[PDB]
């Protein structure tokens, strides 16, 4: 149908039809009376999968004999969504895939529907990793992704009378069609035990084992014939584990345990021994595989040569004192030569300066569980704050300060300390944020070590999300410039040259359209719930979090209602305001903030003298998958964090890319997209870090708001008074508390520019023309944030490698 | 090679090399530089498999069509053992694909050692279910094997320091080929709550739910083209199951332990609710697939017509109750018709008259698992005990003797009693047996209901107990007779026409000859012990219980080892004393008598003085897949049960159409296997039924034996001094003891007759004529033993069903 979607040639076409039909038969066991639609699902999958293992096995293969150096990406999350469609994307499938299945008498959108997310990661930090694969096998790089094959990733959000409900994500249950046991490289990982004092070393005796199992996915370059691996630890009891009889195998459970569920936790730390364990086992078997693929290319010289480890985050943070574990005490090389390799080896990226979400782990845990790693990290310590000690002689609360031990009434280990201290290159996500890391929490840092602090600006894959997610957009853009944007995202600002193209603002504007007609039907079709499309599609999609400000978007969604309710026969642009994403289990306030929502939503959606003006939707288990169905339906799109706390974003980049406008603070990457696109071409409000830095020093006081504000007074005493719970007045007491007392994330202080500059968004929408003449404007401008920009700076700047675009042999 | 492993056509072996080549490469991800022994398994066993998957989905389609009645056999256990070269044997597929693998340059018999048994079986309870699939299939019969798929099967055997050590048998490790699971037909299965009367009935509520997952393996029928079903269900938690988080998510495993291992105990009942959760998981699973089935084909006046439920001894007599429950509580069936419907569908099998074998189940267990199945037990109980009181008026104790109830410390349920007045046929597995079964243990139900008592002689697979174990036994038979017999035994006869041929009296010698070289190799190769290939192999393979008496097997070992050093120069017949077989994790006995046995060889295997002329040796870890070495390499087959204890046995049975001679009690199926080959033909010793009887009444005193028989006297005195156990003397003290003073299975009564026998089977083994012309009217007179015919009369006299040897279309 349309051209980026490739080629359906009559011999492929015949061809994906037969070999459909074979796995039908020979795979699933069925024949076209009894198959279900989730039968000819796994038969697609199948045929589909058979045109990757030629280019998978080649891959690997050639590696192998061109032995360029290795970069191995350590992540305790990878949230890939689901593999079908991106697969066919990458491969030029997709249209062949459509006729063929189209012959079949089957709807190919259909079938996609039925695949199961890959939920293994929580937010930004495990999309990260994932757009980072993409990117990495397109620009040809031996690169490998390692973590943990959880059984259950991030939870199924269910919305039972306003509240969140949480369900297992049973994700394998049908199995999972893309994944490769590999129990033939399966590995020991050893927990607790003590330490030995010999004459030749130190031993760690006494252990017990726990079997790593690795499953691999393959991850496909875009059109370039490049096949990488990513792979995902499994844990296994040995079987002499615990050996009355029947208990013993029972018990089998409690080391499986390990790789059973992902901590649904985002921007959080929580110091359980459960997680502690996922961390070591995640770290021990990769590092093993890591020099077992080395040593089959003694002379660990060359080891950082052809040996990258790239840390995302802190949380493989004990891949450092595993590396000097293994050289040191199984290797037996000298302590500093084993320091250079592993500083050589690692770089270390950072994610956020929050104080809850930095991982500090206490050493009476590390002391039971890792004892031999504690010593390694003492002796890491005294080392490092010798040569503290030499060039500031006589500062002695910058020792105190730089120390990965930090004393108090539990002694703890700073795993982002430790980090620095054994890496070459530290790096943020977004400019303000590494401008942040050096002149604040790693400031000390920093002044020791200049050339070790670096920014990455984070990106997104335009695979996933734009020709994947958004097939109308690519293809008008494709018609005027061309398909090499789709892996030269940068080729976009020829757009700027269409500006005043009234054809191209027509089609822009119909994509859009079309976009947010299929995305109202969907939810009719699957959630029942009403919508005008005409309305302006107000969207604030990620985490719930007090850092995120929902809250905010909660109180300019009441003005209006206020407003309207005021004056109910003047005219209003109508909106469909959307927010959704999950809270931690265990978070009180994101929970409250989500009920919140959903009883504003009662209150308006009822209302008969809103009418269609204004609706309040929360959309109910976000998810990559939802991600790219709301996403490409957005007109403005919510990044409205308080300035300092966002460290990047990176949901702001796929708005971007697919025609919504943004209003937002000046946090994280939005202050580089509206250099980008131009100030004028963003909708820019609210404090900026320096102000927040004066009200801190003020100190904060939100009554100040609440006396001068009598629209955001109002709102307040409805909260109070039972306006939006009626059967339950006091309901959002604890809401109201926080706001007036200790609000952390200064909603108030926001609240007036935050009104006033959706007001001019308002006024923009009634001009559709420049509306549109905007929206394209930022497309334009959106190709520095793609992750093929980002992970070349990754690759010329940390790794020491070369990017390559050039095929491998089909 | 040889004729009866069929064709290896041209045009067969190049698309089995081609289609091997494909699972390699598509399904393995491998290519013939990286690929392991393993890798080449299962492209083999992939490639074999594509094979029965159209007889799979035609058979299926067929008994859809034409609606015969359907046959379901419930088992808790299934000992399948290997499944390859089964398969092969089956399609007629194993001439090609050894031709297609050499070839390719591999040794298939090389590659069938990878292949794990599934071993979810104990011993022969187990393996007549496995058996009896095969003959049912042969047979073209609709039948359905139903059980529970363990994770965990018999745990595998090791020998410590003459002890054995129990571990996990982790059969799906590497995953299972020969399975398809079928998440589509996921059923829920109740436990626990509460039951509640109301006006339309009782309700059974609050009940915690797990779910039955089911994963379908075929069972392919001798060159018929018939490919049956066994499903084997598995357990899984609801995804709502008890929804910290995390913690919730963790115990998940509770409920998903119901099918996590097999109970590893042999003729014992052990009253743990995790079995009795099992044996309610597989019967209510199978139950709603059962009538799910029969309502796809309202009125069940014609259930019983299409449908034979068999239980497999009382594991599965829930099915009683559970379809009374489904029939009255959901179908709203009044009682006696929904009794009707169920006896007419329900037979059961009994398997032992062992009292410590019976299950009994505790009332407070079943009133807290299972509230609303005890109640509908004491209403079956009350009607059935009115049945008792009008037939035998007055009669007081046989009401208490024949209630399914039992008072006294604990109150139980009798699950036997419980068949039978639910079943309409009653069956015991050996002549002898059912006789017992109507004189002794059940003589009060036989009395009110003779019609229900029947026998059916178990029997053995001539597929895997012959044509796959001893090709070179069934080639030179098939020479002679042709190959009918293979599905016809009984022809099997036609080779005493053959006793005085020298041609083949020298074949028969010969195959065996060829037997004992290829296991006294495969010991030196995996085990590294040496054996004279040249002596009589003397072998005594089956579970360890003190009725099988391995005991006295060894007080005949010490007899020959005391006879050579008392008269060192004169001659004996060499003789290889094999003993194998697993123990119950917590039978103590049964562990002590391997640890006696390992200590005699440890004694007799490196006296110089015996030299090669008697070795005694353990079998570790006697499974199916050993089984079908050793038997085509036995010489004399030890089934030496105390008379009136081994139901049936039917190891007997596959040493007998091995060429072994038999030297055994009178009891079980051996009474019928002498009659067959005549008792001429047969090493009988020992007391009979009638002689434990006499000595039961008037008290087995031991001591009595021990006084008159002083070559007896000095085995013991050698036993008790510590003279196998020179370290720790008093290590067989509690042997020593149970014979003294507490044997249940008069050890000492048949020893004189035993070894009196022995020195008549020596004396036979000096003349090599004469011992094969014995062994050739074994083999000629073993055709009784076919599954083949005990399937054909459950078929026509239990379920009403007619057999067929008809070929299904290609
Ligand atoms: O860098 C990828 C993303 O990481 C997010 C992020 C940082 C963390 O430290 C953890 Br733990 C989870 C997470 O999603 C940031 O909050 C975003 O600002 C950023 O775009
Ligand atoms: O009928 C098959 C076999 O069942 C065996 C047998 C009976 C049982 O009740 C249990 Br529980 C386990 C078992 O293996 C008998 O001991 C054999 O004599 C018989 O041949």
Redesign the interface.
């Known amino acids: 149908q349309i051209s980026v979607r490739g080629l359906a040639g009559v011999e492929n076409v015949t061809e994906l039809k037969k070999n459909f039909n074979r796995h039908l038969?020979?795979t699933l066991?069925?024949?076209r009376n009894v198959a279900?639609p989730?039968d000819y699902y796994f038969a697609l999958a199948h045929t589909v999968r058979?045109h990757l293992?030629?280019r998978?096995?080649r891959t690997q293969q050639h590696y192998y004999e061109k032995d360029p150096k290795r970069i191995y990406y350590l992540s305790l999350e990878f949230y890939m969504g689901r593999t079908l469609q991106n697969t066919m994307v990458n491969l030029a499938l997709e249209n062949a895939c459509d006729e063929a299945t189209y012959q079949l008498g089957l709807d190919m959108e259909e079938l996609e529907e039925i695949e199961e997310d890959a939920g293994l990661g929580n937010g930004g930090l495990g999309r990260l990793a994932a757009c980072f694969l993409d990117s990495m096998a397109t620009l040809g790089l031996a690169a490998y992704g390692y973590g943990i094959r959880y059984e259950?990733g991030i939870?199924?959000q269910k919305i039972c009378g306003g509240w969140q409900?949480?369900?297992?994500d049973?994700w394998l249950?049908?199995?999972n069609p893309w994944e490769?046991?590999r129990?033939?490289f399966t590995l020991p990982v050893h927990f607790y035990g003590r330490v030995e004092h010999t004459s030749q070393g130190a031993k760690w005796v006494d252990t017990q084992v726990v079997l790593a199992m690795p499953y691999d996915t393959p991850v496909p370059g875009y059109r370039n014939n490049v096949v990488n691996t990513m792979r995902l630890w499994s844990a296994?009891?040995p079987?002499?584990?615990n050996?009355?009889?029947?208990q013993a195998?029972?018990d089998?459970?409690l080391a499986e345990?390990i790789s059973?569920?992902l901590?649904?936790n985002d921007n959080f730390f929580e110091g359980?021994e459960?997680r502690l364990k996922q961390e070591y086992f995640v770290v021990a078997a990769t590092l093993q595989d890591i020099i077992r693929r080395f040593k089959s290319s003694t002379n660990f010289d060359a080891f950082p040569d052809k040996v990258a480890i790239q840390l995302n985050d802190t949380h493989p943070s004990l891949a450092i004192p595993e590396l000097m574990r293994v050289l040191v005490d199984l290797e037996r090389l000298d302590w500093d030569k084993a320091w250079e390799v592993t500083v050589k080896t690692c770089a270390y990226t950072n994610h956020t300066v929050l104080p809850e979400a930095l991982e500090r782990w206490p050493v009476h845990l590390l002391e039971t569980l890792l004892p031999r790693h504690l010593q390694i990290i003492y002796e890491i310590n005294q080392r490092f704050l010798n040569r503290v000690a030499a060039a500031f002689p006589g500062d002695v609360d910058r020792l105190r300060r730089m120390s990965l031990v930090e004393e108090g009434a539990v002694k703890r280990i700073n795993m982002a300390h430790l980090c620095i201290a054994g890496s070459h290159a530290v790096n943020g996500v977004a400019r303000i944020h590494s401008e942040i890391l050096k002149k604040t929490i790693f400031k000390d840092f920093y002044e020791l070590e200049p050339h070790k602090f670096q920014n990455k600006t984070n990106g997104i894959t335009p695979r996933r999300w734009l020709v994947l997610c958004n097939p109308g957009l690519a293809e008008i853009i494709a018609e005027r410039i061309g398909e090499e944007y789709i892996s030269d995202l940068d080729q976009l600002r020829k757009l700027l040259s269409y500006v005043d193209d009234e054809a191209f603002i027509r089609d822009v504007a119909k994509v859009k359209q079309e976009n947010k007609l299929k995305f109202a039907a969907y939810l009719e079709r699957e959630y029942k719930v009403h919508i005008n499309p005409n309305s302006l599609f107000d969207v604030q999609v990620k985490r719930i979090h007090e850092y995120k400000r929902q809250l905010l978007n909660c109180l300019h969604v009441i003005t209006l209602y206020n407003r309207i309710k005021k004056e109910p026969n003047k005219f209003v642009v109508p909106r469909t305001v959307m927010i959704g994403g999950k809270a931690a289990?265990?978070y009180h306030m994101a929970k409250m903030i989500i009920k919140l929502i959903t009883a504003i939503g009662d209150v308006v959606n009822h209302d008969p003298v809103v009418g269609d003006r204004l609706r309040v939707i929360f959309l109910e288990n976000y998810r990559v998958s939802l991600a790219e169905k709301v996403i490409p339906a957005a007109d403005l799109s919510e990044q409205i964090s308080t300035a300092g706390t966002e460290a990047s974003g990176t949901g702001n980049m796929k708005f971007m890319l697919n025609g919504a406008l943004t209003i937002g603070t000046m946090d994280g990457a939005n202050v580089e997209m509206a250099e980008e696109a131009g100030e004028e071409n963003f909708f820019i409000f609210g404090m900026r870090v320096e102000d927040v830095d004066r009200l801190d020093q003020r100190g904060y006081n939100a009554q100040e708001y609440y006396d001068r504000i009598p629209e955001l007074r109002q709102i307040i005493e409805q909260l109070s008074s039972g306006f939006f719970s009626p059967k339950q007045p006091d309901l959002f007491k604890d809401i109201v508390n926080m706001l007036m007392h200790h609000d952390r994330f200064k909603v108030f202080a926001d609240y007036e520019e935050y009104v006033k500059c959706q007001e001019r968004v308002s006024a923009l929408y009634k001009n559709p023309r420049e509306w549109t003449r905007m929206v394209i404007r930022n497309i334009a401008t959106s190709g520095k944030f793609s992750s093929d920009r980002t992970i070349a700076q990754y690759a010329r700047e940390i790794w020491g490698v070369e990017p390559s675009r050039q095929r491998l042999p089909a």
């Open positions: 038969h020979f066991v069925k024949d279900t989730r058979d293992v030629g998978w096995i259950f939870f199924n409900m949480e369900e297992a049973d249950r049908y199995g490769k046991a129990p033939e296994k009891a079987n002499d584990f050996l009355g009889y029947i195998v029972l089998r459970n345990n059973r569920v901590y649904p359980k459960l289990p265990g």
